[PDB]
Amino acid sequence: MIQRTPKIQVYSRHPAENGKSNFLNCYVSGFHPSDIEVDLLKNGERIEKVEHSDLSFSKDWSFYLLYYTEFTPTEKDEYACRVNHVTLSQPKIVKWDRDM
Amino acid sequence: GSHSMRYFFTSVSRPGRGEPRFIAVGYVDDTQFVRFDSDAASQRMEPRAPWIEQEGPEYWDGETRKVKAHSQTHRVDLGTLRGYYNQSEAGSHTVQRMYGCDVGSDWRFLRGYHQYAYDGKDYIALKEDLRSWTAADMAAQTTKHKWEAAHVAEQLRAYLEGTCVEWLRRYLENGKETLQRTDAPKTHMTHHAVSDHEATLRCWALSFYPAEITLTWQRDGEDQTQDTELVETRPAGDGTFQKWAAVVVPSGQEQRYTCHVQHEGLPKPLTLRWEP
Amino acid sequence: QKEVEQNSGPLSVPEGAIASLNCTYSFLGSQSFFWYRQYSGKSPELIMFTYREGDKEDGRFTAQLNKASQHVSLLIRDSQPSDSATYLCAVNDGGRLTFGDGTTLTVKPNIQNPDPAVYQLRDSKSSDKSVCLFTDFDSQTNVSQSKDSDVYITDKCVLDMRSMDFKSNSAVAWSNKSDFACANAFNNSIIPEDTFF
Amino acid sequence: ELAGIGALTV
Amino acid sequence: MSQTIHQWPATLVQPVGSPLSLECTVEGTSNPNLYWYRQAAGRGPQLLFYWGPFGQISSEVPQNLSASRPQDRQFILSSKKLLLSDSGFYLCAWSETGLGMGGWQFGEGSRLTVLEDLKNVFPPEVAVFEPSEAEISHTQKATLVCLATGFYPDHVELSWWVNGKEVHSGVCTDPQPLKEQPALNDSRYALSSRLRVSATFWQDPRNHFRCQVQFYGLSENDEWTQDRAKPVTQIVSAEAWGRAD
């Protein structure tokens, strides 16, 4: 029996440009078990239309999963990804850094 | 270059909430091409890549029957495993299985694998010689003996060394435009100052395929690889991949150095200089 | 398009000879193959199975699998009359078996001492109803039907007397209409032995 | 193409 | 402790519109895959249902039939109202759980005949014919013939009995029956069998020979309108004793 804490990255599909359709991704990986809570936030409030990739795993049996939603980026709006998992002592939030 | 076909299966029990959640997925190289989710409405193996959609109804029917057999068989495995590990009927457990085959530039067989895990730990795995079994502990020895008696190893050999490669070679031809494509990475360079005497300079690699990539750092006409922090290759979500290795050696005026991108397709290893 | 093709038969093979049964399947992804034996009025019995190219022998039975041409064979060495049956070829196209319609095989016994003859038997229970027995004939002998008028003539069946170590062919004809002996019972036949007191 | 053999219960 | 599979009943003769219930039972393994197949004369078995240990996997939708699995090792096939087209040889089969080479054995099967009209059903009349002297004095062998005539439908099981016990050596039974009236669609059938023994064995009057014919027909409670006794499932036989010249 093993539980593995997840690695989190939040980013965009294409290079962001104020006023240009794009996707907001949140890639969680290396975790176990598979039950995980991932939400994409917009200035605090969560986003409704958010789909994810089919559950898959690595050579060490740890899972990875991609959550995403289309949107239009701007400088006055901050986006983040709220993840929670049994390994964490509290939900973890990670803002989307325009260049990261 | 080399190619492979892998199948991943995950089954999670849900004490009190009916049957287990089963998700099976299929990949050719870094491309998912099939899927099955016990909770989906279709209750069919579904295509996830254009080229596989051209397969006829008989193919889909068979894959669907087979993936459902796996589903049910894993449901049984969950029950047997609680027994072997003397665990209560409460609590959720996970069973995972994976198998596939690898082929080189000549599309000839290189190796096959077939592994099985329980609660995130190795349980039983077929050794590189496709005859022997690696049994984690006592519970796994019981499986090992049952599978050795039924000659699972030689059945698996027949598949991995034969059928798996034959189909891998069929999918590569039919999926020519996708699977044998090679998207050179779109390189990039940025930097956000933060005091002058110690800012940051970014080195990106976007829209590339396949995922395999190797971006290293060299400096002052020499080379090292111990400090610089890089991120795990991540999916863009449109088929391609992204990866960056930032320069954490800011010295006012960034000394002379450049990224050494190594990736199939790119004629010669690319190198990005930093200049305003 | 037929998923599993097999010549129907009846295929004839002399006792002692090798019988070869062939099968062709259309489903490229079939990964295991099976052969079943089926006697009249019975369910199929599994003879053997295979999952890899090449030959597989089990007693007198050898199965052969060639994937490039999607062909499966079965050879029966030293064929015996009791091998007479319909052999079904089955392909596994995913968690289940898909069958062909089978090939009917008839292994003809070798009669060491032909003693062709037609005999007239009478009913045991007080009756003027009679039967005619054509027996001890060669396997090369083909008993014809009685397309003409009433009268009935059974096909030939092979009889084996364990102990006597003697097999025999026979056929039966009978009628109900009066004035019917068995000097002309079997249209096409050899020159057996017709007797009368 | 899923394997049609060698998949048994533990 | 090995594997076995059994199905019941073996033969059925029912009228159009009646309910059907076939059973299948397996022993020797647990959580097996269970299959129901249907076989038509001249053709190979056709899949009706394929069930895994936890539920149906096949996607086929056979008209007017349904399957159920009340226990791990009990598999049932049924119909509420049979159609003529439901006649066939119902075969049950199992495979080891998963995708493997273990199992793949059939039950003994259930033969089902559905009839439009039951008035056409008749059991067989059985007669045994004694050996010919010509044969005895010419080969020192004696062949008894048994005729089972006038039956319908065409499924009967013939067996010879000597001195209260069944015998297989020296026996030859036609693989299939003749139509007594080839032209008539619902014609009745006939079937012959031979029992050859040594002359000295037949010549002994102490020996008893019986031709037994098991016939499968109507159920005691089947709708019946004819004067004659209801032609239900029964055993009809004929006998003969040894005779010295």
Residue numbers in the entry:
A (entry chain B): 0 to 99
B (entry chain A): 1 to 276
C (entry chain D): 1 to 197
D (entry chain C): 1 to 10
E (entry chain E): 0 to 244
Quote the study's own text.
The α24β17-A2-ELA structure showed that three hydrogen bonds and eight vdW contacts were made between the TCR and peptide residue Ile-7. Co-complexes of α24β17 with A2-ELAAIGILTV (A2-ELA4A) and A2-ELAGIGALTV (A2-ELA7A) enabled a detailed view of the atomic bonding between these antigens and TCR. The crystallographic Rwork/Rfree factors were 20.2 and 24.8% for α24β17-A2-ELA4A, respectively, and 20.2 and 25% for α24β17-A2-ELA7A, respectively. The α24β17-A2-ELA4A structure revealed that the number of contacts was comparable between peptide residue Ala-4 and α24β17 (3 hydrogen bonds and 10 vdW contacts), and the α24β17-A2-ELA7A structure showed that the number of contacts was also very similar between peptide residue Ala-7 and α24β17 (two hydrogen bonds and eight vdW contacts). Here, the less favorable entropic values that were the main driving force governing the weaker binding affinity observed for the α24β17-A2-ELA4A and α24β17-A2-ELA7A interactions were most likely due to a reduction in the expulsion of ordered solvent during binding.
The T-cell receptor (TCR) recognizes peptides bound to major histocompatibility molecules (MHC) and allows T-cells to interrogate the cellular proteome for internal anomalies from the cell surface. Here we explored these issues using phage display to generate a high affinity TCR derived from the MEL5 TCR specific for the heteroclitic version of the HLA-A*0201-restricted primary melanoma antigen recognized by T-cells 1 (MART-126–35) peptide, ELAGIGILTV (A2-ELA). This TCR, α24β17, bound to A2-ELA with an affinity 30,000 times stronger than the natural parent MEL5 TCR, resulting in picomolar levels of binding. Remarkably, although the enhanced affinity was mediated primarily through new TCR-MHC contacts, α24β17 remained acutely sensitive to modifications at every position along the peptide backbone, mimicking the specificity of the wild type TCR.
